[PDB]
Design a protein around this ligand. Structure first.
Ligand SMILES: *[C@@H]1O[C@H](CO)[C@@H](O[C@@H]2O[C@H](CO)[C@@H](O)[C@H](O)[C@H]2NC(C)=O)[C@H](O)[C@H]1NC(C)=O
Ligand SMILES: CC(=O)N[C@@H]1[C@@H](O)[C@H](O)[C@@H](CO)O[C@H]1O
Ligand SMILES: *[C@@H]1O[C@H](CO)[C@@H](O)[C@H](O)[C@H]1NC(C)=O
Ligand SMILES: [Ca+2]
Ligand SMILES: [Ca+2]
Ligand SMILES: [Ca+2]
Ligand SMILES: [Ca+2]
Lengths: 301, 74, 308, 4, 4, 301, 308, 74, 4, 4
């Protein structure tokens, strides 16, 4: 039996793997500490906001900014700064964008407070739908008596684009609801739907579908010239009369063309501009933006 | 006798040492496997992707009772 | 005498059992080194997100819901004109909405075992891309920082809401009608009151399954914040290893040590034991009054609101 | 947990 | 959008 | 009876006064001829026109004219020359005046063609009321792109005067009606009433009472932003909006102060300038005049 | 025989009437010298007007009434860009208005017995100040010149209107739908046609109360203009006093001599006779076909308008 | 008879002389009165004022018929 | 105005 | 002035 004691050696075998295993564990814990040092940062966000600031996108463009994208602005009378999308050109013109339609992802049937404050999303590439907010449009367009211009840009389901300019554009205070006012239609291939249109269903159509001097309305705050509620019937937020001839915050129809049956009450409620297409053609893309009038927009210097 | 019943007893103490030792290394190994599963998963929020893996403490659990039978039944 | 049987019986068998387990532990170790090395390759590239920014903004998530911000998603907030605007997840659906999320666990995608500076500045992902959208509507795992949170609670009376979910979908809540977090010079000292909820009052009363002095050392209210490189706990020891933040794994308002461990280690499937836990303690995303010490939540979140 |  |  | 024949003498007595009557006739006839010679000229007219001509009053002043008074001018695109009143100072500034009020002797309730062609009278002393005519104001102010400035000068019923200046003043062609356009208010104690005024009746007052970009209106040619007829209600021809904050072609009231009951429709229709006096205070004197901007009017040189 | 009565009968009465009359004429004489002498003193100062200029202007009174000028008063007209603008009286009320006055008689305030050069250039007053007004709305007596008249008529088809009125208030017209006056080198030859009206067609036919040759020598149509220092009349005489412009007393289109004499002498009251007239003839503002030769009008005027 | 019937007929001739002369001189004066009237009135458009006056040919006409009878009834 |  |  003083042989079976061959175990002396076998036992020393086991002791060796036991000891290398322990060190291999210590080594592995070192390697785990080195993976940890690589897993500390957050995912990288592609969206970024520029640091230059000013009273509006034109003030930003005069301070040197060259790129289109996200910036903070702060008009004189404004209490807090707010984010906007600035459209900058090679000619140094800085446009502040307040409305964008491009794919139907956002729902534009919002209430009085959502039209006041703003809804939708901002993007550095300008590839998102939004409404900037009536309070903001009011603050930028009425800073110390500086004539402002509005430019509307349309696009149809064939790549074809048209524009429409308005001089001395202003949005009024919340106490005047946010009345839209402009002096004159300043040109453009899309024509002047703000002047109203004669749809022919009646001799009074042109007068009841003009937009100058109309208060803003939403389904829960009616200030239209109609006995019913234009905003609740057409499903949007807009400067309604009885009810409209231009309607960019309307319903997004895929394909352009749509008909009375597609509508929920039998009225045209799509993204329309009556001097460019029928009331039964809804646009593919839209943009509303503003700039001090002395600049471009059929402008001086 | 030294070269017998004594030598036996001498070796039994060394096996008993091993036994306890491997009892503690199975616990270290279970703890390192769970710690590595948690730290790899915690890279999902920083890195392009995290390794898909599957842990099951059953092989560890089979081995721990197994060893306990031997230690006990001694 | 006949005990020399075990020379050809028992020893050989012991040697059998020991041999298989030691070789088996040796192959597991080599595979785990292969796993850590693969993940280090993957970590040469980063994850990315594109989070388009909601037009609507304000001082915190309660001003934003009152501005019409009705969907839950990432918003920019500017609690103070002196501070620069920053990103946060707004929860606009639970308990009447307007909640500013300060912490979020849901998957174990982010490491919460960090030092003092990272807990002060914040870490982790506030939000990720909803499948096929250009905005971030899903919350990621994160810790807002300690300076941001203390400033938010110091603007005015503030309420705290903590929500959790286990691994079969049950859910409970803990509400504190008052919550303040002091400044860094005061070590982020916490104060809470006016509890209501179904999760059990772990912050003000400690673990309901302990008695006397064992219970009172697990209360969180009145404590300072500790991290593993900054001991400010309620445990007065000499052994450097005896630190609630080194055991237990996160940065928290530890007291010898806890009844709740949000910020703990995320164990997959919920159950865990002492021989799974790095230091042999109850680390792991715990709420002792609901599920005890050895169960780690699937979901755990913390969020605040101006009150009014 | 607590620490006795 | 007239309202005949 | 050859003694009664004493007639021979007394017959020769009549004969003498016959012949001496005869010669008194002939002498008086020569006196009538001298009187005829002195009664051949017409009455002397105290009014005279100066002989120096040019493109506007500043062009006339640069050619040598020193005295204020009546001159013919002829802008390049005008078909026929026309008379104007020029105001010429010591400094060499030649203002062409296009509106004058001063005593209420001329009625300003006139029609589209009268406002276009001009009415009232021109005097060498500048003591007459008149409207020069939209067509002429247009030709002078749109001359080959040369910036013009406008000066409004007001006088109250107490000896006080005030002024208001506007840069890059222009009046548009008849096709666009005779749209008023300016780039910015350039200063003056009278205030900027063309910017609009918040009268306090309604929060929309300011945006309904501004004049930049407004078209010209008359009772028979309504181009205002109002659903009613501003020109017909206030009795004038003006660049109406809804309706006005500045109104220099309004109704003339003795002493300035007037009230709603004096008015035929209950609206303020007098000669107002709301940034300077209440809407119920009508000016005693007014003057609207223009000059190339490079001159005075807050001008360079 | 007894006839020698008349020596102390008739003779002495004859001498009685004659001597009376003779000494009555003496006293009229010196009373006339005394009127003429008072008028010489008044003629030491002139009469004055202040005629401020209407803003509205044009080519003639018809373009002005089209441009909004609806009141009758003095205006400035510029018929041609080569001629300097000049003053005219515009009648905006008779026959639809737009009439440019060319001759006017109404009181006898201007002398019309003038030479060729004044008739060429114009003379008299176009307008006088309305009671208390800064503008001249009342017409005076005048003759527009002959060169201005000739240019007005050759610019296009022109109608002529002649209006008159007696001392009781009766009014008549003579309207000629076609009217032209050549230039000076053609002696201002007149041509008229298309007669209408109540006064009688004196210009084209002659005095209807005369017959045969006596009528046709009183036609004005086709005649030249004559003045007292320039004889172009239709009377071939050798005696220098025998000129229609010297007898007849004005400047006119005389033919041996006239049926009409506007531009004649103004007799107060209407009626006059051969022995009141300077040369024994029917001078006087006459229109034979209406009131014969021995009645002078109260008012007489000539005016033109484009026709169209 | 000379100094008588002859002298009477030698005065009668001179009386018919004056009759025709005064006939002529009444016509001259009636014409000058008219001429002076017309000329004073035509000073109203040039001079500061025209003398207001009245003219009646009556006194002139009576003296004419008057004159004519005597001449006739001779 | 005729002259025989 | 204004109009409502
Ligand atoms: C506090 O907690 C401890 C358990 O961690 C309780 O412990 C006595 O503690 C000793 C030391 O661990 C044990 O050996 C005994 O088994 C315990 N005895 C009893 C009777 O429990 C202690 O009781 C707790 N204190 C209170 C007040 O509950
Ligand atoms: C017979 C006849 O007609 N005679 C007349 C005569 O009476 C008149 O005097 C003269 C005009 O002067 O014309 C002739
Ligand atoms: C013309 O009139 C005279 C009178 O002057 C008259 O004698 C003569 O017969 C008249 N001639 C004609 C043709 O009538
Ligand atoms: Ca309504
Ligand atoms: Ca401690
Ligand atoms: Ca109107
Ligand atoms: Ca002759």
């Amino acid at each position: 039996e003083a042989s079976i004691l061959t175990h002396d050696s076998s036992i020393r075998y086991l002791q060796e793997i036991y000891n290398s295993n322990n060190q291999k564990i210590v080594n592995l814990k070192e390697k785990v500490a080195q993976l940890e040092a690589q897993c500390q940062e957050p995912c990288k966000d592609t969206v970024q906001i520029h640091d230059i600031t000013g009273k509006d996108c034109q003030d930003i463009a005069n301070k040197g900014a060259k790129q289109s994208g996200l910036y903070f602005i702060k008009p004189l009378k404004a209490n807090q700064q707010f984010l906007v999308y600035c459209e900058i050109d090679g000619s140094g013109n800085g446009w502040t964008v307040f409305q964008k339609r491009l794919d139907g992802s956002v729902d534009f049937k919002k209430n009085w407070i959502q039209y006041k404050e703003g809804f939708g999303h901002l993007s550095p590439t300008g590839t998102t739908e939004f409404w900037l907010g009536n309070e903001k449009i009011h603050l930028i367009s009425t800073q110390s008596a500086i004539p402002y211009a509005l430019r509307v840009e349309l696009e149809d389901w064939n790549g074809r684009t048209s524009t429409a300019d308005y001089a001395m554009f202003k949005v009024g205070p919340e106490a005047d609801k946010y009345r839209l006012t402009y002096a004159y239609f300043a040109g453009g291939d899309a024509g002047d739907a703000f002047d109203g249109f004669d749809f022919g269903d009646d001799p009074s159509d042109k007068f009841f579908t003009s937009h100058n001097g109309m208060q803003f309305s939403t389904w829960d705050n009616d200030n239209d010239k109609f006995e019913g509620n234009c905003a609740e019937q057409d499903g949007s937020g807009w400067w309604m009369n009885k009810c409209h001839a231009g309607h960019l915050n309307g319903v997004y129809y895929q394909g352009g063309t749509y008909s009375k049956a597609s509508t929920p009450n039998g009225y045209d409620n799509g993204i329309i501009w009556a001097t460019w297409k029928t009331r039964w053609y809804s646009m593919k893309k839209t943009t509303m933006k503003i700039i001090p009038f002395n600049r471009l927009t059929i402008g001086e210097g | 006798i030294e070269v017998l019943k004594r030598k036996v007893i001498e070796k039994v103490q060394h096996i008993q040492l091993l036994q306890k030792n491997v009892r503690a290394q199975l616990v270290d190994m279970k703890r390192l496997e769970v710690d590595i599963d948690i730290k790899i998963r915690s890279c999902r929020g920083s890195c392009s992707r995290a390794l898909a893996r599957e842990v099951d403490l059953k092989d560890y659990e089979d081995q721990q009772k197994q060893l306990e039978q031997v230690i006990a039944k001694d | 005498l006949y005990i020399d049987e075990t020379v050809n019986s028992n020893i050989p068998t012991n040697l059998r059992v020991l041999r298989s387990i030691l070789e088996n532990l040796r192959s597991k170790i080599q595979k785990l080194e292969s796993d850590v090395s693969a993940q280090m390759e993957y970590c040469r590239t980063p994850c990315t997100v594109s989070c388009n920014i909601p037009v609507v903004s304000g001082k915190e998530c309660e001003e934003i819901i009152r501005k019409g911000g009705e969907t839950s998603e990432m918003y920019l907030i500017q609690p103070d004109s002196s501070v620069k605007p920053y990103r946060v997840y707004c929860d606009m659906n639970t308990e009447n909405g307007g909640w500013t999320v300060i912490q979020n666990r849901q998957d174990g995608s982010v490491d919460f075992g960090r030092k003092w500076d990272p807990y002060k500045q914040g870490f982790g992902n506030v939000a990720t891309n909803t499948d096929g959208k250009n905005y971030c509507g899903l919350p990621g795992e994160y810790w807002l920082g300690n300076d941001k949170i203390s400033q938010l609670t110091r603007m005015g009376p503030t309420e705290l809401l903590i929500e959790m979910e286990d691994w079969k979908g049950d859910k409970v809540k803990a509400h504190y009608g008052g919550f303040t977090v002091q400044n860094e010079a005061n070590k982020y000292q916490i104060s809470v009151n006016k509890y209501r909820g179904t999760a059990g009052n772990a912050l003000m009363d400690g673990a309901s399954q302990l008695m006397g002095e064992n219970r009172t050392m697990t209360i969180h209210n009145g404590m300072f914040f500790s991290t593993y490189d900054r001991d400010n706990d309620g445990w007065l020891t000499s052994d450097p290893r005896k630190q609630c933040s080194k055991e237990d794994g996160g940065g928290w308002w530890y007291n010898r040590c806890h009844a709740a461990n949000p910020n703990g280690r995320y164990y997959w499937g919920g159950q865990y034991t002492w021989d799974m836990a790095k230091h042999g303690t109850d680390d792991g995303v715990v709420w002792m009054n609901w599920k005890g010490s050895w169960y780690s939540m699937r979901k755990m979140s913390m969020k605040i609101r101006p009150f009014f | 947990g607590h620490r006795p | 959008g007239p309202r005949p």
